[PDB]
Design a protein around this ligand. Structure first.
Ligand SMILES: Fc1c(F)c(F)c(I)c(F)c1F
Length: 162
């Protein structure tokens, strides 16, 4: 198991434009295209991302290309953030994957609300952190995924992903 296999499980793989859990146009392995309700706007974002006129369909290779870029971008974003970098650096590699997973899903807009969780994670108060993480819109809207990510933070194992 690793961050790629982990996010592949959590995001799935779809080669045509679909709406994510929040109703936003998405493609591939959870590559958010736009929050705009316009399918045409979404198709434009896709074409821009892939570098060709796609008409809303991509290949597995192209999906994997975007995915690698997205994971890379998520990690790079963590390291460039003053409030995130020290917590990330404090973690072991398994829990770092759990951090990347959350950033991938919600971005730094969504991660901003998790200040108290981050503090408990840096303190290595794993059970307390796990309890705090669940007290969130995130947990309530995507409980099965959140439970997997939280278990990963609680245990520092891949048990929730087999
Ligand atoms: F740096 C970090 C993040 F950006 C993050 F989202 C989470 I959840 C973390 F647990 C973390 F350590």
């Amino acid at each position: 198991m690793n961050i790629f296999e982990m996010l592949r499980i959590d995001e799935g793989l779809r080669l045509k434009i679909y709406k994510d859990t929040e109703g936003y146009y998405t493609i591939g392995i959870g590559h958010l295209l736009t929050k705009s309700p316009s399918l045409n706007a979404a198709k434009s974002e896709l074409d821009k991302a892939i570098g060709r006129n796609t008409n809303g369909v991509i290949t597995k290779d192209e999906a994997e290309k975007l995915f690698n870029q997205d994971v890379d971008a998520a990690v790079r974003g963590i390291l460039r953030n003053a409030k995130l970098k020290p917590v990330y650096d404090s973690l072991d590699a398994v829990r770092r994957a759990a951090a990347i997973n959350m950033v991938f899903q919600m971005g730094e807009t969504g991660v901003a609300g998790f200040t108290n969780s981050l503090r408990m994670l840096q303190q290595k108060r794993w059970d307390e952190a796990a309890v705090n993480l669940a007290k969130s819109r995130w947990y309530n809207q995507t409980p099965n995924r959140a439970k997997r990510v939280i278990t990963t933070f609680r245990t520092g194992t891949w048990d929730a992903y087999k």
